[PDB]
């Protein structure tokens with residue numbers, strides 16, 4: 001059941017912003033590890049004396065990396081005279097975020113029809129304001145409300161290239177890397193208590209819960225067409241193996257974004273290219289499941305994937321799950337930075353053609369138990 | 381003239397430590413861009429609840445990348461019970477350094493015969509103490525004094541693998557990258573006033589000045605065998621083009637390390653491999669000199685390099701200078717991070733065989749004027 005109760009018109013995920021200590025080095029690492037191109041910048045060379053911001057793109061996926069300059073460069077500025085291209089940016093907030101949480105996502109940005117109205121409706125329905133609506137060059141409006149922890153939900157709306165004040169980057173500096181990633185599928189938060197988090201966010205967006213004993217309890221909030229998907233996790237305390245959600249909250253100093261799921265148009269090619277680069281600057285992957293997990297694939301998805309395609313899943317360490325409507329291919333990276341906090345998921349979905357409907361195959365919940373039993377091959 | 385007046389026995393450069401916000405991402409970028417292998421770690425997986433530290437190596441060159449964890453992980457610790465592997469590390473100092481200066485060098489480490497004696501002699505001769513001598517596992521002694529700005533000179537001495545508490549890294553995680561870089565040749569500081577900086581450092585080391593109108597005044601301090609080379613720059617104010625030394629001091633919030641010069645055993649191969657990677661996660665290089673600069677190479681170094689080797693310098697943008705004893709090949713990267721502060725120099729020296737004596741060919745001073753005149757080809 002989909003009650004289509006969005007309180008304002010939401011389009012698609014627009015971008016994800018990381019707050020960094022040095023945006024250059026993180027952006028360059030991510031570009032090589034994920035196959036994203038450098039497409040826009042806002043920094044000293046563009047007149048921005050406040051923050052350095054670099055945009056990576058792959059298909060429709062947009063990753064923004066921002067770090068503060070010395071406050072001394074902009075000490076004579078006031079908000080009415082700022083050279084910052086992102087008006088919500090604040091030196092003190094960014095340095096406090098990074099010292100507290102380490103490298104992580106500050107903003108989950110969605111494109112809406114009217115960011116001014118989205119903000120006003122959100123706060124009238126309980127959203128905690130973070131940055132009021134600001135009109136950039138009479139062309140784009142940005143506004144921010146609190147989502148969970150120190151993560152904000154950013155509304156962006158366009159009258160009619162990323163943002164005013166950003167520049168297209170040099171062709172020579174923009175190598176056309178591409179490993180197949182195409183869009184953000186979903187973005188997952190970790191909180192200490194699921195109930196209050198869900199009520200708060202669903203309360204100000206109108207997002208509805210999306211149709212679904214180790215580690216977590218979870219639930220997914222979805223927009224009207226179910227293309228914006230925001231799952232939220234809480235720990236389950238007191239078991240034998242310590243909850244990875246609890247470990248996250250300890251090392252992150254509280255609630256924050258846990259993982260970003262990136263859709264690939266060819267997950268076999270994406271993982272081939274990412275795994276080739278794991279030990280030469282890219283990203284590492286969780287340990288692969290045992291061969292018994294793939295011996296058990298035939299009975300569950302043997303009508304969807306060939307034996308060769310199943311053998312191909314086994315080489316790359318890909319996980320497979322199944323809903324009533326679709327099939328899910330997925331895999332998880334090791335943490336993206338120093339702390340055991342944020343990581344990335346690569347996914348591809350098959351089934352549910354109409355365009356493909358959102359969340360086709362779900363989110364992999366059945367893999368927890370399929371892993372444990374397959375990891376009970378300590379007798380073979 | 382070399383008075384050989386070192387006040388304690390100095391061996392070689394040992395390592396350079398960067399203070400970072402996220403050591404993982406900077407270490408991975410540098411590894412790919414420079415061709416250095418991951419060789420040691422000290423982090424949560426090794427029992428260190430205080431800082432994450434990753435060591436990259438190429439030949440004898442050692443780059444250390446360190447970032448702080450949340451202080452909450454180690455809140456019950458005291459210095460006598462610390463899990464830190466580098467006893468001088470302090471959460472507050474590191475976060476303050478990074479917020480003030482951005483990504484940069486915290487420590488220039490040299491190996492000595494007795495770091496305890498080096499520290500005591502240094503401070504008896506005016507060195508400002510930073511971290512007292514500490515004995516690690518009865519095997520290694522580390523001590524630190526202030527060098528300039530917030531950069532420290534670190535003494536390391538070994539009774540008889542990097543440091544106790546560091547672990548050798550997995551073979552699968554240690555890809556054997558190598559672009560030819562082999563050791564640190566020299567490390568250069570930028571200060572507001574050269575005179576007082578030289579007197580302070582030469583005063584506590586006994587290092588002697590090494591035998592040598594746009595931008596800077598400079599001088600080089602050298603150890604007894606002239607294998608440890610520490611140049612220092614000051615700005616020249618009031619000219620037409622703004623001093624790059626002054627720009628550094630503004631963006632860095634004062635004195636700090638300006639550049640690291642890395643010796644290559646094959647500078648043609650090093651620059652081939654680095655330039656291939658510039659736009660896919662590695663490092664960018666300053667713009668190459670005009671063809672007239674290389675047309676003028678024949679008359680200055682035509683007895684040292686063939687026309688083909690000169691043509692090869694032109695393809696890679698390599699600069700060439702000449703002393704009375706030797707010849708110098710050199711090139712400079714763009715800044716390593718967000719701020720126009722620290723950069724890297726790649727160098728190879730030819731001449732002065734005995735082993736090669738230190739500073740053979742000098743440091744490239746003649747290139748300033750050879751560039752200006754060659755850049756006066758706006759008439760050809």
Ligand SMILES: CC1=NN(C)C(=O)/C1=C(\O)c1ccc2c(c1)C(=O)N(Cc1ccccc1)C2=O
Pocket residue numbers: 186188218219220231232244261286332345363364365367368371
């Ligand atoms: C669940 C779920 N619900 N929702 C909304 C989601 O998006 C979602 C996942 O993405 C998801 C699905 C399957 C697995 C994991 C995550 C996972 O972490 N592991 C094992 C593991 C990997 C790395 C570190 C520690 C433990 C799995 O088997």
Ligand SMILES: CC1=NN(C)C(=O)/C1=C(\O)c1ccc2c(c1)C(=O)N(Cc1ccccc1)C2=O
Pocket residue numbers: 566568598599600611612624641666712725743744745747748751
């Ligand atoms: C001098 C000198 N004295 N000592 C001890 C040294 O180590 C030393 C150099 O390394 C050195 C030698 C030649 C050049 C540069 C540095 C340099 O920066 N440029 C142009 C340029 C490059 C990048 C940004 C702005 C301007 C040169 O032509």
Ligand SMILES: [Co+2]
Pocket residue numbers: 186188259261345363
């Ligand atoms: Co997921």
Ligand SMILES: [Co+2]
Pocket residue numbers: 566568639641725743
């Ligand atoms: Co130099």
